[PDB]
Subunit: 165 residues, 12 copies
């Protein structure tokens, strides 16, 4: 009977993480500030759209394997497992640092769910692989702002008041 | 100095209410069940899209009058003022009853914010009028399922196991 | 000289009937109530669009055969030949019953106009056949809500307060 | 209790006037004749589309504030308050004169409804302002054919058989 | 064996007439002059597109009933049966007069072909009815510039140097 | 040599099942009757389109691994393994019951084919997982009409003449 | 009472023939081989789309005149009246030969149904004429690959291993 | 008589300010230089499009209330009331500073015009509120590049040669 | 060093002339009056769009050859070389006369710039040829309203109060 | 005065050649037969569209330099200078041979017109270069069917009854 | 540490193979000759687009797992492992033979990479499965030109100068 | 005979340079890092698309003048004449510096080819002018990141670790 239970756990846990990212990307989209604010405003809206699409796919896969989906605000708050994004005006370097970490953590967790369910539910595993793909792409897109190169360490001093990020 | 403060209060309070409706319409979209489940699945997705558009407009009007916007999950939970939507599978008659009440309550509250800010911030008042317009349309769209007519009281007995809703 | 006169009579009579259906479908679209209100709201808007397209085609065919077209409100009222749709909130079962009858009556009348003009004006007859096609499709779409089947008479008791429609 | 009553009166009266304009613009579209017939055929179809959109918005605002909407042909005829458009072939100069007057009269009446309801129903007032905007634009578009200029009074003699319009 | 022969004759004769109209509408589109030049430039391009579509449909119906289609320039010139459009700059009133006559003549000829083939080839008759429909609409669109009305004979004096057309 | 043979068997068996569903969804689309007829008409057309897309993908994957694809009507009839849909007018409750069962059975069979071929042909397994995903979504969409909830068992009595489905 | 019976017979017989062509064109689309395989792959997909559209129109015309439509696989097999398309890889010359014959036979049969029903049901006759039009166009499109010309008999030897087709 | 005069003054003054912004945003779009040049190139083109749309709406509202609109270059130069944008290559930090100030000043002036005309011309007031909305959004979009945050003052030193902006 | 200088002079001079035409076409679009007002309203908006596109292309070609572009309002006023368009309501005949002259003058000037730069900067010459093409097309489109024909001198008396233009 | 005369001669001569190609490509499109009939049907429709676009551009450039354009059928026949395309069914190899020659001849003639007018009318020369570009591309597209390669002379024996083309 | 190393090796090796196919399909697209040149021109452009899409996806998956991507021309040349496509004009039969082999070889190599990485990186394995799917489809599309059938071996003699391919 | 030879040399040399830029822009798109990585990612994709379009146009112009086109990877490597882009992660300042130089060099070389061929092949010269236009625009778009202004030298210190670029 832990067939359905394992699939549900992986889908529901991924759903809540995506919804948390939905609210955080949108929050950063509105409030990000600094040299890169508009670049990140646009980039975060793209991430928001991709995350939102997969949140709907994950929720409906849960209904498809026969379980209701819990997307309520109390459930997002109850099932954090990750830091909250600060309120107020948000600096561009802070947004980059925040999602570099958040996307990496979410991607790692999905990666393990994939292995957990691939035996009993390869079609769910397939969907979670597609979520992992996009979250890891988004992680790269945040990582690349500070990626070291042969000619420049890209410390971020220029977007962080002269101090490395 | 309560110029900005009055506008911010009206915008932020509306923003949180819209985000609460975002999560509730999406929750009902996934989990609604019964004779009208597909009708409501489609209708709730339309509401979700309209609510989501105005949530972004409200948040950016707040940035435009010079204040950050708080769209975090903890803030949605902290600033409820309305019932939560039940978890689990949701009956069509329950969804109709829930949003008939929720949209009416949200619309009434926006209606009062409009009067509060129209003197100091008519452009914000204009945006909140547009939000009120759509929320009240959505209220009608839920109300109409049970609207009494000369030939039929439309008690809802047929979607509520033989009992009036 | 009754060449033009026969064509004009068939086109003008069809034009007025289409315009009457335009106003009735739109009236039902706004005011329909009950379990099927949203289903019928959507369906009636589709009918409205198809009826409106053919009303313009019929009027311009009348101009093309050399006669002015009378689409005035007084002419719609003067040339009824069919019941009026009730005012006020309209029950879903009442809307279905109303258009099941109205579309059947309009279709039968167009069907006879086709035979009347096919000899002297086959191109007008061709247009009226296309109108008959769509009106008869719409009749089916209303009829199907109450169509008897081997497993269920579909009396409509569920959308008509427990009583067969 | 005259809250709803004042809003309903303003919405319903505007709805009937828009529907009257719907039928008149379409009638003029089919039957207009003369040098400017095609120019006006195209222009009147644009007006028809804008008027039709606002007729639906007005009717659904009426449902949104809790009242049924009366869009029946008998109601258009009963609630005239304006001249009827002539039947038969219509001269271009006659169409221009007719709508120059009709749009001005309708716009003035909406303008007063706006003031009547802005206190109790600013969101309805907002919609009626948008209707007033388009009707007054359309009035200009008809007025401009005969607008006096420094170099030419534009009497219309050229579209009215040598006589000023 | 005169089954195919009757269909071919009707299709080929219609094809050549459409191709003649193709070249004449395009010629008038480029060279028309006067007050209505731009109105007619646009209108004639619309006619050109509709005529061109039916020319392809007629030619392929001929291939479908098993005969090659002759759309060569020498065949258009050889099979005139109608006046040629003048070269040089063309006055707006001259273009209106020309196509009022040409479309009427072409429409009458198609009308008779329809009756000739409807017994042996109703599907070809159906296509020729659709051609007749559009040609007669185009005739109206040219006729309407000079259509007499109760208030104005619309003699065309204003587009023809003070003289009735 | 049973590499190709195992892949072919899984692809061909899935192809025939999809084609059977193609014809059954289309049959139900035309003939469904009752309160939910239009809801199901629309929903079944969506299913038809998704099933049709995957039928083409499955057939071309079979050609891609080097085998011809058998999509003939005799093969659909020969390779049933599932009930036939009744002829005649079909009740809405009967359609829901029929596809709830059919989609579940087809999904289970695809699920096992996935495991059978994932070792020798993971790319075919990947395609069959995508088919399983959509069939299981469609199963949910039919299941949800009768899904039990805390407030309502949703027996279907209202769409099945007073009797539970 | 043989009014409905004659229309039903013509519509149902045409429906089954179209559905048979649906499956055969799709089968040929997947499996066709040789020099012209890709040309025919594309062409057959176009035919498939046109045939599929008319199959839906025919089925819904049957519902519109008040009869259920039988589109089940057993009915396609039971009501053959035409050869089956071979299974396995299909040569380009074989596909051309097959549909040249099949489309001609189907077109001839529809042609007679048109005459049978035109008196009692001209609107159905109109639809069947449109089906005949497209089937006869498709016949030409297959015929043209082997059409004799003054300079070349087009025997097909080049697509049929040196032997005339 | 100062009804029209007050509306005209508010519309014309807004029109000239929008046209001045049109030319300045386009000038900055072409000539902006530095780290943010491409970000601002894109952003300024978006502003240009929104400003251009409202310039046309304002001018046509002026025609709609019965007055000609003055959009000539001499009038833009004559009615400055704001600094001119420098010629030559423009630094990104200079563009941000320039429009942060310009949009704030224009927004404040429109805000007062709204109050001036809302009594006599609420529909004009409504349009000017929509202009104020977009100008204030654009002000935020320029302001955000230098917005102070808890972790970073965003002095702009990085886009202004090491010196705070 | 007069390589860049010759290209810059030709590009900048063309840019200013296009921007002057931008403002003049838009001014005429809003204020044109008389029989042809709507025809010219539409035509002038098309010209405005084409002129605006080439203004951006010319400005960016200037940046591409390494020089900043001066599109400021003071520069348009300073670099007139052509008459200003009158303010106030503008008669249709006056607009036609104005742009007939203005487009001819601008086209002639561009024509000479092309020859000046074709040796040192053929790619700039290529762009200026494309500008010349469109300006000369627009000149024709204004010229054609008064173009003499064999049957009618088209004096414009009908759009100019009985007097030749 | 031979400025205009040289431009007119080059434009008019090109216009007539394009119109001749219009009719010939369309004739070949309908009547082409053989193995490549459908390939050429599609390709010739693409050529037809490109040729038709440039025919309109050439004619309007003629109006733009101040001369009427002669696109009449008699002028196409009078100004041949090239062979006529045969009537009747046309073999694929014959169509390829025909346009290989025709496009080469037309391209060579345009090429010389370009040099003739480039001094006095570089903008016309620019347009004729664009026509030459497309005609020479089309020549390649016909040439390539018989282009010799290291491994195959591509004699065309397979599309020409065993004989080299 | 060979986690990343195994994924990188599989992604980079696939990337280089796709880029090699990009250049080869484009080369064949331009230079292919013979009876099938246009068929292959079109087909190869479709392959080019699909290959190009997956090349970008593979490169960005490499960035997503934390490694730079090497898409330089020297790397394509250095990492051949497959024959080069001949220069000069290319015969249709040669292109078919070339890609039949090349796509098969590339597909086999991707197939093995999938198994190599599926344990440590199932999301990368998922992407490589999608690449394998399209490459194997393209292989079929080239294979089908010479696929043996019961009625015809399809030796290719007709596209290869009388000799089997 | 050096007619074709001069055109071929100019086209082929331009083709190879464009293909080299294709691979370099795509390489920079994937691997660029630092503050401007996303700005350049987007900008480089736009350049890639424009370069790719002109590469196809240049190759097909070569086929149109009768010569095969060499777009093979070995030819790109053999015909360098320009530096290679570094492998590995690429800093934003390095990408800007690289393409500022590369686009300038390519543009200068095309500029000379234009003069070389304009006499014998003005249509090829026309195409190469269009390539020069876009390459020089792209050069500006890279140059502008470091363009000196009156208020800021834009040394790039902020994107290059504190050191001028
Ligand atoms: Ca770093
Ligand atoms: Ca910062
Ligand atoms: Ca009730
Ligand atoms: Ca229920
Ligand atoms: Ca019943
Ligand atoms: Ca009811
Ligand atoms: Ca006047
Ligand atoms: Ca008149
Ligand atoms: Ca008259
Ligand atoms: Ca005239
Ligand atoms: Ca149940
Ligand atoms: Ca039922
Ligand atoms: Ca033959
Ligand atoms: Ca063969
Ligand atoms: Ca700051
Ligand atoms: Ca700077
Ligand atoms: Ca004149
Ligand atoms: Ca005038
Ligand atoms: Ca050869
Ligand atoms: Ca042949
Ligand atoms: Ca073979
Ligand atoms: Ca060959
Ligand atoms: Ca610098
Ligand atoms: Ca850097
Ligand atoms: Fe959903
Ligand atoms: Fe999988
Ligand atoms: Fe936003
Ligand atoms: Fe307001
Ligand atoms: Fe508003
Ligand atoms: Fe508004
Ligand atoms: Fe119309
Ligand atoms: Fe007919
Ligand atoms: Fe018909
Ligand atoms: Fe028809
Ligand atoms: Fe509506
Ligand atoms: Fe308001
Ligand atoms: Fe065609
Ligand atoms: Fe018929
Ligand atoms: Fe397919
Ligand atoms: Fe997989
Ligand atoms: Fe259907
Ligand atoms: Fe008929
Ligand atoms: Fe405008
Ligand atoms: Fe307002
Ligand atoms: Fe630009
Ligand atoms: Fe040039
Ligand atoms: Fe044109
Ligand atoms: Fe040139
Ligand atoms: Fe050019
Ligand atoms: Fe060009
Ligand atoms: Fe990319
Ligand atoms: Fe997988
Ligand atoms: Fe997958
Ligand atoms: Fe997938
Ligand atoms: Fe290409
Ligand atoms: Fe040139």
């Amino acid at each position: 009977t832990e067939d359905l239970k394992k699939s549900v756990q992986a889908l529901q846990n991924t759903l809540t993480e995506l919804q948390a990212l939905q609210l955080q990307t949108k929050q950063a989209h509105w409030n990000v500030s600094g040299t890169l604010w508009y670049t990140l405003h646009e980039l975060l809206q793209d991430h928001y759209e991709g995350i939102s699409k997969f949140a709907d796919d994950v929720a409906e896969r849960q209904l498809s394997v026969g379980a209701s989906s819990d997307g309520r605000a109390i459930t997002i708050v109850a099932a954090s497992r990750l830091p909250e994004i600060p309120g107020g005006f948000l600096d561009d370097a802070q947004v980059i640092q925040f999602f570099t970490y958040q996307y990496e953590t979410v991607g790692q967790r999905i990666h393990q769910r994939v292995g957990d369910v691939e035996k009993v539910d390869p079609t769910t595993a397939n969907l979670l692989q597609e979520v992992e793909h996009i979250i890891e792409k988004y992680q790269w897109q945040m990582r690349a702002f500070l990626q070291n190169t042969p000619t420049d360490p890209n410390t971020g001093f220029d977007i962080n008041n002269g101090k490395p990020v």
